[PDB]
Amino acid sequence: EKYIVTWDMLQIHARKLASRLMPSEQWKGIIAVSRGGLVPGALLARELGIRHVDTVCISSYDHDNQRELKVLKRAEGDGEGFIVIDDLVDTGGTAVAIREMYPKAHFVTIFAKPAGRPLVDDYVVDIPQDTWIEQPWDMGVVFVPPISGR
Amino acid sequence: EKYIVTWDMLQIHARKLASRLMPSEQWKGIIAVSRGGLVPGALLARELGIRHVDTVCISSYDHDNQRELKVLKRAEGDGEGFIVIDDLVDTGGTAVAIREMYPKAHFVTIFAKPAGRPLVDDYVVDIPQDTWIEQPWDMGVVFVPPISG
Amino acid sequence: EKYIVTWDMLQIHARKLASRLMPSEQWKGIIAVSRGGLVPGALLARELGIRHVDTVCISSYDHDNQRELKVLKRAEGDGEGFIVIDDLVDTGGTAVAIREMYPKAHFVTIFAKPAGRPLVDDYVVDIPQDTWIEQPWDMGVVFVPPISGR
Amino acid sequence: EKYIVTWDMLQIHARKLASRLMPSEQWKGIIAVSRGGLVPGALLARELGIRHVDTVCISELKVLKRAEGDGEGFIVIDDLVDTGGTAVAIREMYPKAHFVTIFAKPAGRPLVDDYVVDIPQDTWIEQPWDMGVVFVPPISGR
Ligand SMILES: Nc1nc2c(ncn2[C@H]2CCN(C(=O)CP(=O)(O)O)C2)c(=O)[nH]1
Ligand SMILES: Nc1nc2c(ncn2[C@H]2CCN(C(=O)CP(=O)(O)O)C2)c(=O)[nH]1
Numbered sequence A, C: 001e002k003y004i005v006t007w008d009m010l011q012i013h014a015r016k017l018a019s020r021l022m023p024s025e026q027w028k029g030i031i032a033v034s035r036g037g038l039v040p041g042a043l044l045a046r047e048l049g050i051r052h053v054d055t056v057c058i059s060s061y062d063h064d065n066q067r068e069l070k071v072l073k074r075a076e077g078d079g080e081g082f083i084v085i086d087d088l089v090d091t092g093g094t095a096v097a098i099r100e101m102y103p104k105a106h107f108v109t110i111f112a113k114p115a116g117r118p119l120v121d122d123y124v125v126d127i128p129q130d131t132w133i134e135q136p137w138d139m140g141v142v143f144v145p146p147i148s149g150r
Numbered sequence B: 001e002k003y004i005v006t007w008d009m010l011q012i013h014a015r016k017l018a019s020r021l022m023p024s025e026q027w028k029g030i031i032a033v034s035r036g037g038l039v040p041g042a043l044l045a046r047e048l049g050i051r052h053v054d055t056v057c058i059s060s061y062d063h064d065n066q067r068e069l070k071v072l073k074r075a076e077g078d079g080e081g082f083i084v085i086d087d088l089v090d091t092g093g094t095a096v097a098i099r100e101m102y103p104k105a106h107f108v109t110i111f112a113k114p115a116g117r118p119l120v121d122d123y124v125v126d127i128p129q130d131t132w133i134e135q136p137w138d139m140g141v142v143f144v145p146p147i148s149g
Numbered sequence D: 001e002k003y004i005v006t007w008d009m010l011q012i013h014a015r016k017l018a019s020r021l022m023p024s025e026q027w028k029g030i031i032a033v034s035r036g037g038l039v040p041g042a043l044l045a046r047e048l049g050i051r052h053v054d055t056v057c058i059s060e061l062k063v064l065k066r067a068e069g070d071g072e073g074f075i076v077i078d079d080l081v082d083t084g085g086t087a088v089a090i091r092e093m094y095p096k097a098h099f100v101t102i103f104a105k106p107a108g109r110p111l112v113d114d115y116v117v118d119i120p121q122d123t124w125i126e127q128p129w130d131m132g133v134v135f136v137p138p139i140s141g142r
Helices: A007-020 A038-047 A093-101 B007-019 B038-048 B093-101 B114-119 C008-022 C037-046 C093-101 D006-019 D037-047 D087-093
Strands: A029-034 A053-063 A066-073 A081-088 A106-112 A139-143 B003-004 B028-034 B054-061 B068-071 B082-089 B106-111 B132-134 B137-142 C002-003 C029-034 C054-064 C066-074 C082-089 C104-113 C132-134 C139-143 D031-033 D053-058 D063-065 D074-081 D096-105 D131-135
Touching: A007 B068, A038 A053, A038 A081, A038 C002, A038 D037, A053 A093, A053 D053, A066 A093, A081 A093, A081 C093, A093 A106, A139 D006, B003 D031, B007 B106, B007 C008, B007 C139, B028 C008, B038 B054, B038 B082, B038 C037, B054 B093, B054 C054, B054 D074, B068 B093, B082 B093, B082 B114, B093 B114, B106 C139, B132 C002, B137 C008, C008 C037, C008 C104, C029 C037, C037 C054, C037 C082, C054 C093, C066 C093, C082 C093, C093 C104, C132 D037, D006 D037, D006 D096, D031 D037, D037 D053, D037 D074, D053 D087, D074 D087, D087 D096
Parallel strands: A029 A053, A029 A081, A081 A106, B003 B132, B028 B054, B028 B082, B082 B106, C002 C132, C029 C054, C029 C082, C082 C104, D031 D053, D031 D074, D074 D096
Antiparallel strands: A053 A066, A139 C139, B054 B068, B137 D131, C054 C066, D053 D063
């Protein structure tokens, strides 16, 4: 059974993470991990009041049991004083890759499954591995037939 | 901590509860416990395609140190073949009265706290006793100031 | 032409209606037109602090160019000091029926189309006649495939 | 007089915008004007399968961070256009860019190559990232 994440709950969690990342002056800017961290990055940037937002674009595809990682666009630096935000961490693969690119950055997510959980600096919601997360940008409001009808 | 419930989530839970009330034909109608149950009742009504929807309106008169229960408007029958529905059960204070008016009814809620759990026939979500549930009809979409300037 | 009504927007509309119905003291209760008026009625009931909420249940099976009406259940009275509410007005068929069985009732809706427009006492939003209104209780948040491949 | 925009509504408009920008292969990437364009840019990035998303941060109008090129083959996205102070500025850095917003006001209308929703000029747009689902007192007591 999948975990439905609506926009309202995302924003609640995003604000729960924002306050825990106070003060706002200890952070220089924000790096969002495209595309998953884009919205959480936007949300953080609004709350913490940060206007400098950049993106690192990483493309990943599975070829059976191995991953193919392609960084299409990178932000410069060791990550000094920035926050790196992604929507969720599952196995922790993307995290370890970001950690190589930005060894001196604070890495955050909204959701974290048990495996990837310890590989984050901070997160908000716990999810178990067997659970799939539907993010709001993948969903919509559409007609849904009744259960009976009658 | 305060548990926030959005319309969307209420609908998701209402739909789960609804499937557990299949098939629809065993039900004559639906009695909503005003006011909390009105929206859950409405959603159930749609999902099951039940058009016979009635209400029970229950208010509380306080006398000296004790709270009495006034019944402003009540449906008919012993609730035989009916689903009775409230938004939640916290203590079951109101839920005692509903059983007495409708003994032969299927009494359901969306949320339930531990002390009110044995009072319903079925519910969807467990909530801790210390937790306040904010329902979406008590909320709205309003400007929230940022956290930094 | 399809008009999407989310729960948030509906609440906004219902709240605008409720404040136009102030003060609440002039009303002795609410009669909801099942099933469409159930939710709007519940929202009025909350905003006006009205605990006396009853229903009128009507079945409208459409046989070609004629309609068969069935009143499954009917709140008592002429509607004196009562608000009767449906979600929307379309042709005025339901409205003429309510007006007969509740002549001294203040009959309101949220949406209205030009046809049934003169047959309500008050409404909130104008909807064009050729538009289908998708109400939130008939919808849900489910997955939606992206518009493009890749 | 306040135009309230919910996430669901923004997402619908963003999809109506995405459909106009089809086919998606005419695009090499998206440039979101932060912070207004971020979420719209993110939504377009999903609906159009575009993985190359970069930002331009304007703020006199000081440029905090930006990307190169003349915008040829890119989409520049902001949440709205009222006047065009930044819009006039965005035009410069990427002249051959396709520049879109979701909302557009009359005075800002001719500055963008495309938009989705018209809004009166005297109307304030309350974007969902500035709001939240909070308790709201009933309009009456009894
Ligand atoms: N929407 C969604 N995307 C998912 C889910 N699980 C994985 N992904 C996608 C999106 C984000 N992903 C990762 O960061 C891979 P990781 O470095 O090994 O943790 C994969 C899910 O349950 N839901
Ligand atoms: N969900 C939905 N229900 C509708 C619509 N149009 C009509 N109905 C349903 C629900 C309310 N209706 C009427 O008041 C019928 P009227 O006596 O001719 O005014 C029919 C619609 O666009 N959408």
